[PDB]
Every structure is written in C-alpha cells, then in structure tokens.
Amino acid sequence: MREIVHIQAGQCGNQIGAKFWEVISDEHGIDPTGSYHGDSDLQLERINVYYNEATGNKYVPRAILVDLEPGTMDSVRSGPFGQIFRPDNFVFGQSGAGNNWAKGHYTEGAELVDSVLDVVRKESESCDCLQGFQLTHSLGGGTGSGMGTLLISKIREEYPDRIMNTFSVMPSPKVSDTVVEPYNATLSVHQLVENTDETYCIDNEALYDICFRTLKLTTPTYGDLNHLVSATMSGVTTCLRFPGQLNADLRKLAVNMVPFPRLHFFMPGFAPLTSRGSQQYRALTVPELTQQMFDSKNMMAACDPRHGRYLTVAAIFRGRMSMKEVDEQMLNVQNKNSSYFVEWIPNNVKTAVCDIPPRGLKMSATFIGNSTAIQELFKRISEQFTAMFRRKAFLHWYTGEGMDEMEFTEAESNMNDLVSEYQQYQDAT
Amino acid sequence: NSQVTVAVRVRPFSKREKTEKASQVVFTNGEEITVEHPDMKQVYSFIYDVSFWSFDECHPGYASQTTVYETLAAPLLDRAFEGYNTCLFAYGQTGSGKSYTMMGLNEEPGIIPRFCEDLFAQIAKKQTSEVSYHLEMSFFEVYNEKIHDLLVCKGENGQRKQPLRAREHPVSGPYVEGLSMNVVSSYSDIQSWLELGNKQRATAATGMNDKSSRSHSVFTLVMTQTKTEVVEGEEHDHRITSRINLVDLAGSERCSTAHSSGQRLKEGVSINKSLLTLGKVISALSEQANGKRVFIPYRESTLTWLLKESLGGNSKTAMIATVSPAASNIEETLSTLRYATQARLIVNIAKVNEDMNAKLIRELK
Amino acid sequence: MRECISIHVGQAGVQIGNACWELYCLEHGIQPDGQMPSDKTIGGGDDSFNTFFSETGAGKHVPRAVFVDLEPTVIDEVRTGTYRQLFHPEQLITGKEDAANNYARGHYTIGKEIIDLVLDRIRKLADQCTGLQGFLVFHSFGGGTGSGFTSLLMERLSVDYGKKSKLEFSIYPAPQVSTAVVEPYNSILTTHTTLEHSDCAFMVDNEAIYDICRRNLDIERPTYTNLNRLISQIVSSITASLRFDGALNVDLTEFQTNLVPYPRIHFPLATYAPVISAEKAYHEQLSVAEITNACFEPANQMVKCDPRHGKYMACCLLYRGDVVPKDVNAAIATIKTKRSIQFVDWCPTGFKVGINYQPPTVVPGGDLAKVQRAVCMLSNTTAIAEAWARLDHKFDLMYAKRAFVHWYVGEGMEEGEFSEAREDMAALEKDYEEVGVDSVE
Ligand SMILES: CC(=O)O[C@H]1C(=O)[C@@]2(C)[C@H]([C@H](OC(=O)c3ccccc3)[C@]3(O)C[C@H](OC(=O)[C@H](O)[C@@H](NC(=O)c4ccccc4)c4ccccc4)C(C)=C1C3(C)C)[C@]1(OC(C)=O)CO[C@@H]1C[C@@H]2O
Ligand SMILES: Nc1nc2c(ncn2[C@@H]2O[C@H](COP(=O)(O)OP(=O)(O)OP(=O)(O)O)[C@@H](O)[C@H]2O)c(=O)[nH]1
Ligand SMILES: Nc1nc2c(ncn2[C@@H]2O[C@H](COP(=O)(O)OP(=O)(O)O)[C@@H](O)[C@H]2O)c(=O)[nH]1
Ligand SMILES: Nc1ncnc2c1ncn2[C@@H]1O[C@H](COP(=O)(O)OP(=O)(O)O)[C@@H](O)[C@H]1O
Ligand SMILES: [Mg+2]
C-alpha cells in the first residue's frame, strides 16, 4: 500500500486543500461524517492512500494543517468538510509572519515546526509503505514560503528517499498581491531547488485567463480557481488508487520528467474544461483532449512554452479508452511541433491510463510538462529582486530577524544559474 | 584556454601476483594503453595525454616517481607562482597504487612531498625582503554530501563529526563555514597534520579491502604573495594569492558484485553521484577549451561547488588515474580506464597477431 | 510427462497471462473455478493436460504459473476477478513500491526482497513434475521490472536449473511509438545480461499489431485486451505439440536448435497469418498456401522490421488443424522460388515444419473468427540489426549528456555499466553483419 502525507500551510494551501478533500472524498464515496456512502467497491481498496481508518467504519484523512493565524483553521472547522479532520492535527499559533520569510523560517516558525513534525513522524510510522509527501503552499508570503521550505528541509533529512511533491502558487507577472514578493520567492526557490523532487508551478493569472476564455466565468472567486488545482492534484496520484492498463506513480513520473536533478519545475493543466452551454457541442474523445492539453491557453504557469522547448512531458488519462489513440496522438505532436521539443530526447512523452474516470465525465486528462519557458518566471523575479536589493528597499525587515545580506546573494545566483541551465537547452549546434 | 591533463599510472606486478603468476592484460604501444582480455575478444584501446609505464624498470619510458612529478605536478607549481589556481585529482581503486603515486613511502617519495619541498625551495630562492610569501593550509572531507573537518580534536561518542556547510561569497566564490586554517613553513609541520587527518577520515571494511576509503578528501594549500613598489606609495598592498588543491577521490564500486545494505550502500551511491558530476564537469571544461561554450554543473555536488574557482577560468587541472595490469581485475581497470578519458575509446579484435607464428611476412615480401 | 512453467513479470506479462489462461482453460474444458465437469461426465481422459495444469484429488485443476509485478494493482485484479478460484493464492504482490521504470530498481534495491520467494514457489512447482522441458518468461523491455527483475531471475535459474530451455516472450520497444523516455537504457541493460543465459527470445512490438488489427481485423481503436489475445495464440501453437496429438510434433528444444545458429543471435520474430474478422471469414478459402504466404508479408509481421532489408537464417512454421503435409511442401517451395526472400548461403534448408490436429479455439467476446486451420511463424532475420541500432543511437544521444543517469546511480548502478552494455550491443551489430556476408574462397 502506497501512502501520501498532505501538509497544508498558509491561507492558500488550506483554501486549496479544503476543496481537495472535498474532491477526493466525493470520489471514494466518503461523506462529511467520515462514513462511506458509495456504490462501487473500487473506492475502498486503496482508500489507505489518502485516508486512515477509524472505529465505526469512519475514515479520517491523513492531512496536516499548519498556519500562524487561526482565521484559516476556523474556516475549515466551521465549513463543509471540517468534521472529518483530526483536531489534534490542527496546528497553529498566533501573530502571523507579516509576509516576512524570515519570521516563518527562523523566528516564529521555528517555535511551531517541532509540533508539526510530531504529527508527521506520527502519521508516517502509522503507514505501511510511504511513497512521498505532499505540500500545498504559496510563494510571495511568509508562512508558505518560509514555514513550508523549513518543513521540506527537515522532512528531507529524515525521509530523503521518499518523494517530496510540492504544489506552489508562484507570483504573477503583471499585478502583485505583496510588495516583498520577489524577496520571499527567491529565498524559497533556493530551498525548493535543492530539496524537492517535483514541484508544480501555478500562477493565478493563468487561472483567471482559463476561467474567462474557456469556462466563460464572469465572476470567478477563489473557490473556483482551487476547484481546478484540486483536479490536477487528484489526477497525478490516481494510478496509486484505481486500476488501469498502463499504470504510473509519483516516482515513475519523476524519472521520465527530471533529466537533471534541478529541472523539476512543471507546467500543469487539466482537460476537459468547457462552459455549461457548450458541453452539448463538443465531442469528448482522446484527440479533443490532447489538443486542449498542449494548448498554450490551458497552462496554469503563465509562461508560453512556444517561447521554449519541452524537455519531457507527461499525460495522465482516465476512463475507458484505446491505447492506439494515446500513442498515435502523442506521437503526432512530436512530429508536427518538432521545434518545441528537444532533439536529444527521442520520445519526450510519458503516458498513463486509468479505467475509473471522474464523478460525471466519461474521460479526463491531466498534463505535466517540463519546459524551458519557466525561465521567464525566475528571470522576472531576479530583475525585481536586484532592483530592490541594489538600494535595500525593504531589506531591514529581514536582517532585523536574524539574516544577512550574503544569504540574499546566494538565492540570486542559484536562481540565475538555473535560468542559464534551462537556456543551455534552448540552443542547438 | 584551460585544458585538463589526464594521466594514467600502470602499476607493476606485486609479489603476490608474481607468485600466483597472474597474467598481464594491460599493455602499451607508446601512445596507447590496450586491454586484451584472456579470452581474446573485444580489445580496448585508450589514448590519453600522458602514459606512465611503471611496469618494468628496464622498459623504455620507465615512469619513475621523479619522472611523474616533473611531468605533471611541477607545471602546477610554476603556474601557482604566477597567480593562478591549480587542482590535482587522484583516482583509482584500492590496490592500484594511488598512495604510492601521491604520497610515497619512506623512500621513493611522491607528488605531495616533492611538490611541497620544491615549492619551499623556490620560495627561498625568491625571498628578498622586497617580496614575501605566506602559506596557510586546510584539510577536509566529503561524506554523503556533508562536509567534515579532519584537523579537529575529537573524542569518542555518537554522531560527533559536526557537519559544516558551504556558502557563496560574491567575490571570493564558495567556501566552508567554520573550517580551520593553519600556517606552515616546511613539510615536517604538514606531515603531522596529514597524519592526524587520515586517522579521522572515514573508512570501512568491504569485499575489496578491510580498510577502504569511503569519503572524498581535499587538501588545500593557499599561498599569498606580497610585493612592494618603489614609488613610496604602495606600502605592502600588492597582494596576489593562489590555491593548490589536492583531491583524493574514492572509487566507484559496483553494488552488483558486492551484496551490501544500509550505510555502505548509501556511501557508494553518494560517491558514485559525486564522480558522475565530476566527470560531467571535466568533459564540459574540455569542450569549453575546444571552443564551444557550455554550462558547468558545479552546483550538483559539494565537491565541485567548493572547487569551482579551482577548475575554471585561468587555472590548471590534472587527473592522475591509477590502474593495475593484472587480469584478476579486468572490470575495475576497465572501469578506471573508461572513467578517466576525454576522447573516444576505440575497440577492435586483435587475436590475429598469431597469423603464422610471428607473422614472418618477411618471407612473403 | 511434459511440463512447462509459465512466468509473467510486470504489467505487460500479467495482462498477457490473463488472456492466455483464459484460452488454456477453454481448449481443455476447464471452468474458472478450476473444475472440469466433462471428465466426471466422461469417466476418463487427460484433457486436463498436466503440461499447464496440475490436478488435485478433489477435481480442481490448478495452473503451473507464478507471476509477479512489484506493484499490487494488476495482480489484485486477479485476486478479485473471475479467475480468483483458479490460481494458487501464492502470487507475489510484495510490490509496496514500483521500479519507477528503472532497471536499477528491479535489479538491486527492490530487485531483491522479493526474489527468494519467487525461486521457492518455482522450486515447489518443479518438485511436482515428472520432467520439465523449459520455462516461458513473459516480460517487457522498457520497464524496470520486466528489464531488471527479469535479468536477475534469468541469472539465478541458470545456476539452480542450468540446462533447461528458457524461452522469452518480450515486448520489443517500437521506433516511433513509446510510453517512456528511458526505454533505450533499460533495454540495452537487460539485453546485455539476458544474452548469456537465455536460449531464444521471441520479439513482438506493440506498433505492428496496432496496424494488424487496423488493416485485417478492422478495429479502428483497439486496446491491450485485443493485442494480448493474439499473443495468447502464438504461445498456444508453440506449446500445442506438448498437449494435443499431431503428425509432426515439435518439442521446446527444437526451436533452440533450428532457429539459433550462433549463441548470440537468438532473437527471432513471430506472426500469425489468418487474423481475420468474422465477416471476412467468408469470401476466402484460407488454404495452407494463402496462410503461409501471408506470414512472409512484411506488413503482417508482429515486429516493425522490414525483412527485405535483410536475409533469413531459419524459419519454423507451426501449422494447426485440418492441414495436409503436401500442401506445406508445395507452399514452402513457392517461397524459395520468390526472389524477394533471400536466405543465407550457409543455410540451404532454412525451413522447419510442425503440424497439429487440434484447431484453434475462439475466446468468446473476441475479434478473431473461427477457422479450420491456423499458422504460426517464427523467423530469425538479419534485418533486426537495424532495430538494435535505433536503440543504440537513442542511447548515445542522451548518454553523451549523462541524462537520467542519476536516477540509476541513486539505486546502486555504476556509470560504467552503461558502456559495458553499449559495447556488447556494438559487438552484436557486427555479428549480425558477419553472418550476412556471403562466403568466398
Ligand atoms: C453535465 C455536466 O457536464 O456537469 C459537469 C459540467 O457541466 C462541467 C462544466 C464541469 C463542471 O465544472 C465547473 O463547474 C467548474 C467550476 C470551477 C472550476 C472548475 C470547474 C462541474 O462543476 C464539474 C463536475 O465534474 C466533477 O464533479 C468531477 O468529479 C470533479 N469534481 C468535482 O467537480 C466536485 C467538486 C466538489 C464536490 C463534488 C464534486 C473532478 C475533477 C477532477 C478530478 C476528480 C473530480 C461535473 C460533472 C460537471 C459540473 C458539476 C457542472 C467541468 O469540470 C471539471 C473540472 O471536470 C467543466 O468541464 C467539466 C465537465 C463539464 O464541462
Ligand atoms: N502488449 C502489451 N504491452 C504492455 C501492456 N502493459 C504494458 N505494456 C508495455 O510495457 C511497457 C512499459 O513497461 P512496463 O510493462 O509498464 O514495466 P513494468 O513491468 O510494469 O515495471 P514497472 O513500470 O516498474 O511497473 C510499455 O511500452 C507497454 O507497451 C499490455 O497489457 N500489453
Ligand atoms: N489560488 C489561491 N491563492 C491564494 C488564495 N489565498 C491566498 N492566495 C495566495 O497566497 C498569497 C498570500 O500569501 P499567504 O500565505 O496567504 O500569506 P500568510 O497568510 O501571511 O502566510 C497571495 O500571493 C495569493 O496569491 C486562494 O484562495 N487561492
Ligand atoms: N611504481 C611502483 N612500483 C612498484 N610498486 C608499486 C608502484 N606503485 C604502487 N606499487 C605498489 O602498490 C601498493 C600500494 O597499494 P595500496 O596503497 O594498497 O592501493 P591504494 O593506493 O589504492 O590504496 C604498494 O604496496 C606498492 O608495492
Ligand atoms: Mg507496472
């Protein structure tokens, strides 16, 4: 039995995780009381992946909730699916980080991390075979970027041979939500690059463009954006829970997707997405899913892969399909769009198929791509970074909490080197 | 340019091998080391930059200790006295004759003492009281990507070797936080430090030897050269420093022909990864010297990250591999010959040197 | 009596095995519950043929098979499917982690912790036999399990059992279609190891069958439940002569002798000619000649390799059903008359023939039709050297930059093993060339 630990840190992780458990529970037939009210028997065979069991045929998720303010947690408790979580896993203090990566890493988070690890060491040893970890947080803030990367470093030392899968909302290009956004992200990337195995970069502006163009949503709220991320989170690890023809897992994807140990920042997506009216006018087939997957307008990363090359991609399918259609269609992409793929990787595609689709869709598809177009995200942050660090715009709030200027320069170089390493493969001889 | 001088030392037969009559498989033709398996099947050929045939003391081109020194190490000294950085790597399996080449015995000394004493002699010749020199050294190791200091007085308890961490200074480059440094004036005050370190260096008994090396080791000698100009303005401000790095690397060790588990397995994986990254670095540097600019993955290992400024720019790098000629170790010698190589190794079939009893085509002609 | 052990490794093995024992049960009259109601209705007969099924005194018939995945998903379909009451519950699902499409994971790290059980159940199965004829390993190149675990196992069996035929039935990686980035490495690694222990490896690629089902069976979007039924038939023809009556019977050591000239060129192909739908079962005669000529069509090979770019060394033709020998002799001559089919100068005979009287059976729910006669070809050609070269070039392109290597070292593999395995496939590319050079004096 493969098992996964979920860690939710910050206001972005928990507001995402609350839909995630509202998406996985609705799959396996679990209701808000932790009880089973399903129809099919395949919902229970691999329930141990995400949930643990309780006394009266009740199921408690293996979730760990973290924050520095109790506002996030009281929303989960007094909410749709709050009565299922373990109350002893609601870890929180007071007096949040003030969007200071220092406060979440060194000063305040360090007074709370030892209580977090006590839960993690407890849940893991209760598992038969651990497969990896799962963290949902945000860059641009203090807790998610500081407390998250702190837990990453500690877990990695304890469990270095397990996967550390990290979903992270990266900062958007046009409009910010914090002022010290590049300070906190660069210092997070310095930790994620060295310690994680696969991280999925999400950008909110990409999700707004999806809700506007594809879904034709006029007033999208954060409960909808996360209703898209929860889909990707569920598709990646579905082949650990449901059976299929060509199965996969977190480690099989990391091998094919990570050619070199540092290039593990991915551009995700999900199909099929459509409007409530235009559902009667679309034929739901494998090619119609592929054209939507590889479209630049369904990437959550806010970076055009047509300004770069794919090193290697992945395509996870779900439903009753034909395996000739998958292999033929993913081949037609490489031969047609030959210039957006690398020459020294002959087949840049991994494929996986499951036989149990989503609640009300004959089929679905999940997409993971590793492209050099993520170059722009890190290059953008560095220009913001040096433009601030060159005059010490806000540097006195980070040094005041136990940090030096040298630590800021390390995070810049390791970012700028990675920017070049991706650029080294945008070029042919 | 900054090229990489790869060299190979073919150890001669030992007493045990001569008594067991272990047959010879590594031969030379001058500019090529050739491997002919006793089955007389695929014959491998490797062309290096320098070959040291220490096999038989009366063969032409016999590579003595002094020969090896004057061939590889002395140019690094001449480079160091110009204000540039130098690195000497030592690779080989156990029993291949690596310590003989680097350190030496009470007699027939090696690269370490030869370089040290010649360095001090040239320093003495260049001393004037107008030009001054200062020598400061350190010695550390790398174990599972963690740095440990070898010149620290330690007791006996559990998990005592405190790990240090690497940090990047914007100008001076990467370094080790908290690493000690000690000043020297001769070789007799280096020996007692090296003998303190090599007792704390990590070792463990395995199917190859009961005392094998399981951690990379770096001995770094930092020279500072002070000058003064006669304009009555530049009071002891002309400073130029150089770094000589001497790196003992551990062997690959295949986990297939050695059934292992736990700590030894982890050590092997870490060593293997380090060697792979080092190979990538050296090959990319060769390509850079041959013109095509590339990206060097310095950051994928502590060793390369710490040695970044000593393997790039205006610097000199040498890699001494050591291999044994016996047929009892085909897989390791071929593994050490396939590793230390920048050009392409060629393979053929050459059992047809027995055409007709020492061909005797003299008759045909 | 004659007794064979079928081993299925990984996912490509199991999903094929589920199709095979589906068929073996039908030909012999066995229900999924292991029972055989016909024998108690008859009062005699060994139709519960002890080649593939052992029998207990309670009337239940238990198959001689062990299969293992190193992940529990695909076996758990069997422990909860329609064939649960047939198999021995000793099926290995000690697969708490998968091999992540890594050789180094199925050969070392999780390559062990599972193998001692596998050898024990085999040794139990062998101890129940009055004589073995060989093994049948179903696996797939490209994965970590089918590449790594297959190699470790083939090594050990060559020690414990030694001179016993070991016939592999493997999915060869295709040139264009592929479901993984690191297929070229895993194939070259186990090919290096399995070469010195196997005796005959029957190759199949999933890209050729996709076209066969398209052109012949008229299936426009097939899946693996169709590709694996054809593969079930190729095996039945090989193993039919050990179960049913026939005129020219063929044992398992006869493929090893006629199709393997030199010990390193034991990579033959396979195909199955009368693959037709129910509708096209009419409109055609399906004689020995029309079926036998189809086996030499380059478009009906189950491997994507044009034999016209190479020469044939040996070809074993296994006929089934209402077949008369003269029809075979007349047909084999028609092939040697045609000039597009070139044989090596050192093999003027070339052909082997085997004939059986039990026709093929129709798995209900299937796509294949009922016929009176059916044919299975097995050929060794020099054209397959082109396919070895494609893999070696893919290898070199992405090994010159040391890509994906740190995932293998992270499991215990050395950097040098890649070279040691690329040199052995560069010697194989020559041996296929040396053989194809016509002699001179
Ligand atoms: C008749 C019909 O078409 O109903 C669809 C529907 O109209 C559409 C718009 C649904 C609908 O999508 C949305 O309304 C939506 C809103 C904001 C953000 C994202 C989606 C739907 O909500 C989505 C919902 O699909 C699911 O329920 C999946 O199981 C989904 N889980 C949930 O939606 C869910 C969330 C909370 C509680 C219970 C269920 C899922 C996705 C990935 C992996 C597992 C499960 C279904 C069938 C529909 C509605 C309900 C309209 C689609 O949604 C998805 C991701 O599959 C949009 O395209 C699909 C299918 C249809 O186009
Ligand atoms: N013909 C056929 N091939 C299959 C089937 N399932 C998987 N494959 C092939 O298997 C190849 C990938 O290797 P796998 O079989 O998945 O490897 P594995 O034995 O499962 O080992 P793991 O990946 O670690 O689980 C693909 O190229 C597929 O073509 C099947 O049901 N039928
Ligand atoms: N997608 C998504 N992102 C969010 C949501 N709430 C906050 N964020 C992101 O999280 C960031 C705020 O950082 P946060 O971790 O909440 O600050 P903290 O509470 O002090 O740790 C912003 O950049 C937002 O883009 C949400 O509901 N959905
Ligand atoms: N040039 C040489 N001439 C004679 N013997 C040599 C030479 N080089 C090495 N040796 C032999 O090699 C041995 C050293 O092997 P050892 O130090 O155990 O291997 P390693 O250096 O890999 O640890 C010495 O005992 C010495 O006799
Ligand atoms: Mg599998």
Residue numbers in the entry:
A (entry chain I): 1 to 429
B (entry chain N): 391 to 755
C (entry chain E): 1 to 441
Describing publication, verbatim:
KIF14 belongs to the kinesin-3 family of motor proteins. As all kinesins, KIF14 possesses a highly conserved catalytic motor or head domain that contains nucleotide and microtubule binding sites, and where ATP hydrolysis is coupled to the generation of mechanical work. Here we report the near-atomic resolution structures of twenty KIF14-microtubule complexes corresponding to five distinct KIF14 constructs in four nucleotide conditions mimicking four key steps of the ATP hydrolysis cycle.
Construct K755 includes the neck-linker and part of the first coiled coil heptad repeat of the CC1 domain. The other four datasets correspond to KIF14 dimers forming a two-heads-bound intermediate with each of the two heads in a distinct conformation (MT-K755-ANP, MT-K755-AAF, MT-K772-ANP, and MT-K772-AAF). Different from the Apo and ADP states in the AMP-PNP and ADP-AlFx states, the MT-K755 and MT-K772 helically averaged cryo-EM maps show a density connecting the motor domains along a protofilament. This density can be well-fitted with the undocked neck-linker of a motor domain positioned further toward the microtubule plus end (leading head) and part of the coiled coil domain connecting with a docked neck-linker of a motor domain positioned more toward the microtubule minus end (trailing head). In the leading head, the situation is similar to the one observed in the monomeric MT-K735-AAF and MT-K743-AAF-O cryo-EM maps where densities that could have been attributed to the AlFx group are near the noise level. Our results then show that this incomplete heptad, although insufficient to induce dimerization in solution, is able to do so when many motor domains are bound in close proximity in the microtubule lattice.
